[PDB]
Amino acid sequence: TGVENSGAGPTSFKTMKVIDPQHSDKPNVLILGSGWGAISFLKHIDTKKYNVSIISPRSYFLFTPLLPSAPVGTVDEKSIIEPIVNFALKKKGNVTYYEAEATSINPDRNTVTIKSLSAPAEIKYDYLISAVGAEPNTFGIPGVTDYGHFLKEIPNSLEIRRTFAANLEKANLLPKGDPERRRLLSIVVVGGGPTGVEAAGELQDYVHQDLRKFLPALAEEVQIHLVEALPIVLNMFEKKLSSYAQSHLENTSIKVHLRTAVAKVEEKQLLAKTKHEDGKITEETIPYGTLIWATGNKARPVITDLFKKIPEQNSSKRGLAVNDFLQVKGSNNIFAIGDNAFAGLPPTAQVAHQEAEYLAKNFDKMAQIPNFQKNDKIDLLFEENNFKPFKYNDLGALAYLGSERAIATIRSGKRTFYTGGGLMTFYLWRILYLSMILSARSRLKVFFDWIKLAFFKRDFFKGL
Amino acid sequence: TGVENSGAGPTSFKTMKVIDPQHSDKPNVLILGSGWGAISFLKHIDTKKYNVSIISPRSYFLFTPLLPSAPVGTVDEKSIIEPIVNFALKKKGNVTYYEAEATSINPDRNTVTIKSLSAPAEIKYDYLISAVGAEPNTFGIPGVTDYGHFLKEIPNSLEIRRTFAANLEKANLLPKGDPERRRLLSIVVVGGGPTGVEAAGELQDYVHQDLRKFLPALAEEVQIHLVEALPIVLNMFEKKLSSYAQSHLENTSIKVHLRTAVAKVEEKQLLAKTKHEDGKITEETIPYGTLIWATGNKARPVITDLFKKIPEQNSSKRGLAVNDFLQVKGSNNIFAIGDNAFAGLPPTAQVAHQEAEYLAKNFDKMAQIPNFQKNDKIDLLFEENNFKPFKYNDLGALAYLGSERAIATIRSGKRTFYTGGGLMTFYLWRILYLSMILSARSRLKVFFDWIKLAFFKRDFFKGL
Ligand SMILES: Cc1cc2nc3c(=O)[nH]c(=O)nc-3n(C[C@H](O)[C@H](O)[C@H](O)COP(=O)(O)OP(=O)(O)OC[C@H]3O[C@@H](n4cnc5c(N)ncnc54)[C@H](O)[C@@H]3O)c2cc1C
Ligand SMILES: Cc1cc2nc3c(=O)[nH]c(=O)nc-3n(C[C@H](O)[C@H](O)[C@H](O)COP(=O)(O)OP(=O)(O)OC[C@H]3O[C@@H](n4cnc5c(N)ncnc54)[C@H](O)[C@@H]3O)c2cc1C
Ligand SMILES: CO/C(=C\C(N)=O)[C@H](C)[C@H](/C=C/c1csc(-c2csc([C@@H](C)/C=C/C=C/C(C)C)n2)n1)OC
Ligand SMILES: CO/C(=C\C(N)=O)[C@H](C)[C@H](/C=C/c1csc(-c2csc([C@@H](C)/C=C\C=C\C(C)C)n2)n1)OC
Ligand SMILES: [Mg+2]
Ligand SMILES: [Mg+2]
Ligand SMILES: [Mg+2]
Ligand SMILES: [Mg+2]
Ligand SMILES: [Mg+2]
Ligand SMILES: [Mg+2]
Ligand SMILES: [Mg+2]
Ligand SMILES: [Mg+2]
């Protein structure tokens, strides 16, 4: 259905841009999500030839690479989100955002089922764009999600402060010696990837740069462990850099735990195992005030539910396996991009950003084809008209290390433009992250956020 | 300290500045609150000759004038607050803040009982500076607390935005010609002092500027009413100005209800009554989605608690009555300033920023007279010393109106510098306010707020 006067998420709003007919003139494309995929895919697609619809529980778009800077308020949570709406005021034709969530996609009955928590109730789709993202992975390691914080989404950032704020508080009522005070003030990040390292760093920044400047008795006793399973951190960088980073984290009093896996999280301590290069399996408990879980990504119910309803997708695990034109293997009119598509690619923004932009332009290709105005094998039409299959141009990797330092690589093709570095690198990272932001609103807010951060402390209000 | 926690809540910070002999000879001074009076008094007290400690459940100062511009993201709630610590960090001597609330003042036992919501538990004092503010008042009109929203404190801003969004949301799923949609978009501000005005003003902005740019279907139907019991809005501005303000309010589509009083408040609607030129009371139902009740202050219960414990304050209705030396009539060592003090002046912030600065210089002027500590018309102690009493240098009256306009009136004694005006006044007004802000950080943040507003919309997130 998907008609007038229902109840999904209340920003089920329609923007009557151009002048269409009531007899359906265009294909109804329906996007799932409002993140990198869906916003990148929306940002380009020809709205004159297609009737774009978006289904997102979230009504803003998240510039994920600056999220780890939110909790301490290096950046404000607003300063890095954008409403979907503003990207639709930049589309010539017609859009509609339902503020709900996909639940079961019904591939052959040909709808996405939106049931919200803010109320049929399905939505007809001619084509489907499935960029819902991955949800983070605990590995069945018990205790996470009882006692952990995922660094995924804006609320997650608010939860992490409120927690750390509350510990800083409780902690400052105990006599200096007390171990408990020592515990409250400890931080465990679990995740050696960029996210974790950046959170790890951004906290330690705050503690050195801000906290001590008015309660130095606490600053000291703050401890920030960073825990990773593999031989070293930042594995996407060439060995020589990953080391400089690990140098600089420990330089900033970070307790890096390489080759270490979390077997279980209890309330106050997380039982860790370590397997050394001389294969010796040692144990260790790590007590924690605040636990951050910056690791992994698994598939979502919508998708793992879909796996069954498409014979080819029975045994895909990571995401939806996709052919070279990014359609679901097993379905005609259903596509998948970014973290929920299994392209055999890095699960990153860069990939999803390209993935979407290519698919966007291929949608302009198909409109020129009368053959696509109507018609269980599927790819055929993409060959008959000579469509380029998607190939990826991995552009390199940035990561921020703490107390004003960074490392990076940039590339195009086999060519490898640049690679830092230290305090210089920092200013590119800033200058570069700025440019990759998808809105002038957001960028000015972040810009102002860093200028403000020079003259003054971060804003660490627990109720805001 | 040490460990003096028993009543007082978490952010019990202490700055170990000067070297303190356990057994002290400096007097001990207590400031109740963290707003205009208290923070003004904190700023100008000599922290070397005295020892100052504070009690406030609120860990931040609030630039109360800008509050009404936060609910519609004209300005961020963080931009207008600044922490106590941040002020106390720029002092000479030892400051301490027990983040809690006074529950009982104990005049004849020299203590203030503090039961923090977050936890004996008395605090000892030589001198007491009672500056807790007043609370807002319902005049026992049934319904206000249930369905209404005060506009007194930061959380109230979030409460309103949340409310208004949820209605904008719920309304857009109903068809243009529904009553229930008309209602949800109705907005009644009760009380036409510059608050209710500026508020009403700043909403209509968001409707007229933000909302319409993406839902004119909703925007148009949004109605803002301003109810006021008196002949005119903004009585403290001179007669001719009150009419131009009202001209401009009504001319920006704001239904202004003079000589009108809210007899009661129900969920969907509020019954109001209006006395006419001819002295005949009519009735009326105003149905409403959002109810901002910005009218009249009343006596805090700690202040009312302390009316029974002093014979002079037995017939004290409005607030603690004080002499020309701002001292609680009937106590020696307690002082009341701000809206908890009934100094027969208006309950402005302007008053309190004077009431403080003055008392601080008094307090400093009690550092060349070594008899007070070797001490029934106890104001004579000051009169015989030849203490200049307190006099209010009324600096004026400001009020923003909506849609880029403002009214103003700077003066001193009689010598009136100015009285506008239009788009020029809005600019001055901005400038005056921006100057009167108490911290660099607040200022800058407020300054970048306004810039971002010219470039981009406002920020109306219902979870941030
Ligand atoms: C803290 C953090 C920092 C990162 N930093 C970087 C970086 O610096 N560089 C980099 O390349 N990558 C980074 N990433 C990874 C990158 O952001 C992701 O790979 C990218 O977000 C994938 O985009 P996507 O569109 O596939 O999914 P997302 O961007 O996650 O978008 C998924 C969207 O779908 C919505 N949604 C969820 N469930 C449903 C449902 N059932 N129905 C409808 N909609 C739904 C979500 O609200 C969201 O809008 C980071 C990730 C995190 C968590
Ligand atoms: C939205 C709004 C806008 C305004 N704009 C203006 C304006 O432009 N110009 C103007 O002159 N006036 C304005 N006012 C009025 C003016 O701000 C007040 O008269 C002024 O705040 C009084 O200051 P105060 O120090 O007496 O109390 P406040 O400034 O309210 O501060 C009182 C403090 O006491 C704390 N507190 C309360 N109870 C307790 C307790 N039991 N124990 C400990 N602490 C406690 C509070 O958290 C607060 O920090 C405005 C008021 C509002 C609500
Ligand atoms: C906006 O478009 C872009 C560049 C441009 N000049 O416009 C880029 C595509 C832009 C930047 C991408 C980018 C910057 S920096 C970075 C990065 C750092 S690290 C990483 C990968 C290798 C990490 C993946 C981790 C995955 C886990 C979930 C397992 N990617 N990606 O896309 C967001
Ligand atoms: C310039 O600095 C100041 C004093 C000084 N330097 O001595 C002031 C205290 C300054 C501004 C005060 C101000 C601005 S605008 C205003 C005012 C006049 S009137 C009013 C209404 C809102 C409040 C109460 C009215 C009560 C009855 C008269 C109805 N507000 N007062 O600090 C905030
Ligand atoms: Mg995203
Ligand atoms: Mg997406
Ligand atoms: Mg994702
Ligand atoms: Mg995805
Ligand atoms: Mg205040
Ligand atoms: Mg005060
Ligand atoms: Mg007050
Ligand atoms: Mg007061």
Residue numbers in the entry:
A (entry chain B), B (entry chain A): 28 to 146, 164 to 419, 425 to 513
Give passages from the manuscript.
A monotopic alternative NADH dehydrogenase (Type II NADH dehydrogenase: NDH-2) catalyses the electron transfer from NADH to quinone via FAD or FMN without a proton-pumping activity, and functions as an initial enzyme, either in addition to or as an alternative to proton-pumping NADH dehydrogenase (complex I) in the respiratory chain of bacteria, archaea, and fungal and plant mitochondria. A series of studies has suggested that Ndi1, one of three NDH-2s from Saccharomyces cerevisiae, would be useful in replacement therapy for mitochondrial diseases caused by complex I dysfunction. We reported that the enzymatic reaction of yeast Ndi1 has a ping-pong mechanism, as is the case with NDH-2s from Mycobacterium tuberculosis and Yarrowia lipolytica. In this reaction mechanism, two substrates—NADH and ubiquinone—bind to the enzyme sequentially, but not at the same time.
A Lineweaver-Burk plot analyses indicated that stigmatellin is a competitive inhibitor whereas the others are mixed-type. There are no significant differences between the structures of the complexes, as indicated by root-mean-square deviations of 0.58–0.76 Å, which were calculated for 454–462 superimposed Cα positions. On the other hand, the electron density corresponding to myxothiazol extends from the si-face to the re-face of the FAD isoalloxazine ring. The bithiazole group of myxothiazol is located adjacent to FAD and forms hydrogen bonds with the FAD isoalloxazine ring. The binding cavity of myxothiazol is constructed by 10 residues: W63, P238, M280, P390, T392, Q394, H397, A446, L447, and M485, six of which (W63, Q394, H397, A446, L447, and M485) are also found among the residues lining the cavity for the head group of stigmatellin at the STG-1 site; four residues (P238, M280, P390, and T392) are specific to myxothiazol.
